[PDB]
Amino acid sequence: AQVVDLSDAIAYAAHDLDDGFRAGLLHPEELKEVELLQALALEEGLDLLRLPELDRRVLVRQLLGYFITAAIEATHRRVEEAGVQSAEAVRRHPSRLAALGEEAEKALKALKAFLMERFYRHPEVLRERRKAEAVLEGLFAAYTRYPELLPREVQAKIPEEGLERAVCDYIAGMTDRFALEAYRRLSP
Amino acid sequence: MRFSREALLELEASRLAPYAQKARDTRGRAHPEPESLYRTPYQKDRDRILHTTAFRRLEYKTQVLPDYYRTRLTHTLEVAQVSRSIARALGLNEDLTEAIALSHDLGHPPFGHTGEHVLNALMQDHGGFEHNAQALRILTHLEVRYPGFRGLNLTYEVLEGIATHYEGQGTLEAQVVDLSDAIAYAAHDLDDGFRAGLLHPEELKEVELLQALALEEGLDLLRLPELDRRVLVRQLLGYFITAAIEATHRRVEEAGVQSAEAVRRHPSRLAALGEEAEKALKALKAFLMERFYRHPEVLRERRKAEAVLEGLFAAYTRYPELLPREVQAKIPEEGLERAVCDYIAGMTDRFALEAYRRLSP
Amino acid sequence: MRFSREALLELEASRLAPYAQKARDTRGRAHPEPESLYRTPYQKDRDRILHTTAFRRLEYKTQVLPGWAYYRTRLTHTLEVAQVSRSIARALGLNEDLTEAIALSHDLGHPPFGHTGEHVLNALMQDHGGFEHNAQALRILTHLEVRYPGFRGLNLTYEVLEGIATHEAGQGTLEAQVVDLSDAIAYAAHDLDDGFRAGLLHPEELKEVELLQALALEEGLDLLRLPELDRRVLVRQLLGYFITAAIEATHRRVEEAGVQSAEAVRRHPSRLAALGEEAEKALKALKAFLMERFYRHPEVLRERRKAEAVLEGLFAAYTRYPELLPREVQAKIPEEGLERAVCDYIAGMTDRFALEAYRRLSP
Numbered sequence A: 001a002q003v004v005d006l007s008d009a010i011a012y013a014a015h016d017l018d019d020g021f022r023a024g025l026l027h028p029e030e031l032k033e034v035e036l037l038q039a040l041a042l043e044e045g046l047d048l049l050r051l052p053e054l055d056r057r058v059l060v061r062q063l064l065g066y067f068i069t070a071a072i073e074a075t076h077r078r079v080e081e082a083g084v085q086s087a088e089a090v091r092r093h094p095s096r097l098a099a100l101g102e103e104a105e106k107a108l109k110a111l112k113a114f115l116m117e118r119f120y121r122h123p124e125v126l127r128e129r130r131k132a133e134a135v136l137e138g139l140f141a142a143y144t145r146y147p148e149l150l151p152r153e154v155q156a157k158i159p160e161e162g163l164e165r166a167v168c169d170y171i172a173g174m175t176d177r178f179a180l181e182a183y184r185r186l187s188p
Numbered sequence B: 001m002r003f004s005r006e007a008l009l010e011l012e013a014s015r016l017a018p019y020a021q022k023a024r025d026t027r028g029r030a031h032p033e034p035e036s037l038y039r040t041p042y043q044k045d046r047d048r049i050l051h052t053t054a055f056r057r058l059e060y061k062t063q064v065l066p067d068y069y070r071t072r073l074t075h076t077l078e079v080a081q082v083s084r085s086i087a088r089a090l091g092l093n094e095d096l097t098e099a100i101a102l103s104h105d106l107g108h109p110p111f112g113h114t115g116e117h118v119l120n121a122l123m124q125d126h127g128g129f130e131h132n133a134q135a136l137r138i139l140t141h142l143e144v145r146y147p148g149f150r151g152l153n154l155t156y157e158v159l160e161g162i163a164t165h166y167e168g169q170g171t172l173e174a175q176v177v178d179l180s181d182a183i184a185y186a187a188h189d190l191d192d193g194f195r196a197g198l199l200h201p202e203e204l205k206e207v208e209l210l211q212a213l214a215l216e217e218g219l220d221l222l223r224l225p226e227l228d229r230r231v232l233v234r235q236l237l238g239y240f241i242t243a244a245i246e247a248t249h250r251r252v253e254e255a256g257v258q259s260a261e262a263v264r265r266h267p268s269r270l271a272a273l274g275e276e277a278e279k280a281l282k283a284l285k286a287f288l289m290e291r292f293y294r295h296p297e298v299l300r301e302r303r304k305a306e307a308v309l310e311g312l313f314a315a316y317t318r319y320p321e322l323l324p325r326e327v328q329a330k331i332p333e334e335g336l337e338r339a340v341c342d343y344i345a346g347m348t349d350r351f352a353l354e355a356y357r358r359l360s361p
Numbered sequence C: 001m002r003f004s005r006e007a008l009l010e011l012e013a014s015r016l017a018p019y020a021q022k023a024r025d026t027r028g029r030a031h032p033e034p035e036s037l038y039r040t041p042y043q044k045d046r047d048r049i050l051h052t053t054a055f056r057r058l059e060y061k062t063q064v065l066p067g068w069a070y071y072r073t074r075l076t077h078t079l080e081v082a083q084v085s086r087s088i089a090r091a092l093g094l095n096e097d098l099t100e101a102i103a104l105s106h107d108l109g110h111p112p113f114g115h116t117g118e119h120v121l122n123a124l125m126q127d128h129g130g131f132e133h134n135a136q137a138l139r140i141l142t143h144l145e146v147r148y149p150g151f152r153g154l155n156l157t158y159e160v161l162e163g164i165a166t167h168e169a170g171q172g173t174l175e176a177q178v179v180d181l182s183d184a185i186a187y188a189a190h191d192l193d194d195g196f197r198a199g200l201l202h203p204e205e206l207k208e209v210e211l212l213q214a215l216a217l218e219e220g221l222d223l224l225r226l227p228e229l230d231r232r233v234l235v236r237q238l239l240g241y242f243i244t245a246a247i248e249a250t251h252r253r254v255e256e257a258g259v260q261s262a263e264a265v266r267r268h269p270s271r272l273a274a275l276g277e278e279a280e281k282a283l284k285a286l287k288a289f290l291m292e293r294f295y296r297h298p299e300v301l302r303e304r305r306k307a308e309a310v311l312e313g314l315f316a317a318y319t320r321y322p323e324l325l326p327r328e329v330q331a332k333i334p335e336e337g338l339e340r341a342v343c344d345y346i347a348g349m350t351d352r353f354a355l356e357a358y359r360r361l362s363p
């Protein structure tokens, strides 16, 4: 389970970056803001002025390998040095054992800070977020103020779970398109 | 034959009226730059203005009402034609006149005078918004098209014209442009009002000049057909243009001013339409206000414009992070509100409408 | 003071170069009308051209690719051709009002859908007289536009009509010739600009044409990225280059030729307006480059394919079912014939209206 969460983070970092560049939101010059990003691009002779398709793909794969490797080694270390001999021991251990090691740990942090700042807080990304916020808030207010607007199926769960919970479950279980369309259908 | 700028300047003088502004007497430009080989100072100003982003946007910003409605570019070209006709007749600097006419309306935000109104309201607590000053802001600070300085580095007289049409009275050339704008606005909003089927051929009697012109030419006052409308619009422009030339000539003779300097420092404006024309123009603008601008459909679109400008202003003001990074970057030196005002004001009608749409789910 | 037509005519002469067209030497207008007070013959022509319907549609017809969607517009182009030509004319002591009048009217006869329009229309009219934009402009100004009771057309001066018909050929006035040259100059500078602004041209391609690379390298212009400041500087320098070379080379040809009258230009064995050997080379290089990398760009061509299908669908429908035509146009068939009537109608359309008309024709 501990490995899954570390793999989530590694995955986030690598893919956000890929999607960032593809979407045209991240520029090939900002790689300099992350030592790991720069070291890889430079070590492979990548085109840091214009990160062509082939080069981006090399950058993402090398980044994943760097983290998968660091994760394997560091975790072996911490697991050995802890002496755990069973799954039960890992559970009752005073600390989590899945790790990246010092170097990879800060690299990943510096990478997450750069994605937060440049991709997540990108003007265009912030705009679709505000909109997404509006939809959910619109759905929530609408269904709790007017329960009668809910599908009969969901209305029936209100006695068991309570209005708020029943509505939250309904909104949380929706696909993006259905949520958007549901929101649109509430207005003229 | 190759006419260098030095030759053009000399020729321009002796040729123009004494009260006309000669480019060789220019107060100069804020920043230093070599002189042109062939172009005179105003010629260059005309050139620079033509290549600004704001001039290009005129083509995507309608004059009044955001199909048969003309753009601000068309309006500006009509202003340039009327102004140039009047200036040539009075022996005034035509390049200066044109340069001013191409530039006086650059500072309008998307939508109409409507735009400038709501924009000023928002901002009442942050220095306000006026379209002429926005024009000067654009030409001296907002457009970066030359390394070494912001703006266009235009001659003093062109900037002066945008501000006066700065000192007190401006050059006769500048005064002529404002009067031309009025004449232009009038004849063409009347034309567009009819084309849009908003004004009807029977309301013509509400203004004596229109009724008179139409009766005197045998126009079909019941179904004002295309050819008849065109005849009327033409005579209208003809009437006011003649008035302006004659009345201004009179004022100028009365005044005795023998130089542009004399014109700027004169107790009053000299450009005039004269008692009678001044009267008909007033009546006409009033009629247009009532039957065109305040026509229900027009007011419906006015409503929507107010809503687009107000939505964008509140959005970028309440969440600066929604602004392009390039605009966010100007916030330190300009202030949130002004940087946000400059951004909106620089939009085309469709960009603004689309931007406002994108803010919603 | 009040400068009358008479005063202006007098000033004009004695101020202009010998070989420049003086308005007082005009052959006049077809139909008779009282001579105005204040306005010079060409000045009046400028005023009428500006108010024609075709000039107005220029704001709704685009240059290069079809309107529907930031690509200048035929009006922006014209204004730019007017600026370049007037600039060159003045430097050469040529008639500026004549030059202007011609620049403002020469592109009035283009159909909707930039140049692609003219090629498909001419094709569709192979057996009926064909279609040409210069001839169409003339046809509009002498026949189709009716804004004055008493005659069809604008009753323009011989010299302006002459200009539209001779510019873009040994004949015509230096004014007219200067306009065609300005047209080429303007096209080049602005297509380049739109090419880049539209993300269709790339900074790295500037090296393909020696004049461009020469200008980028000289100003320390940042390539690979060619930011707007840099773009605006490249365009301006380019425009300055050709305008300067047009002036110096045309002055050269006119002197070496020895012509001392507009009539001499009209009759000279070759045209005097020129760029000089090196400039003509650069422009030709720039022309080939733009055609390959911009006009033939796939995004541009997919729109051009669409513009043809629209004009083809309009033409076929109206020619096969004249009853679909507005009654006002059906009324002109007997006097013009089916094909011309349809061709004039389609050619006078704005891009936006042509597309709509096309769409209304199908389920």
Ligand SMILES: [Mg+2]
Residues within 6 Å of the ligand: B075, B105, B181
């Ligand atoms: Mg105005």
Ligand SMILES: [Mg+2]
Residues within 6 Å of the ligand: C077, C081, C107, C183
């Ligand atoms: Mg052209």
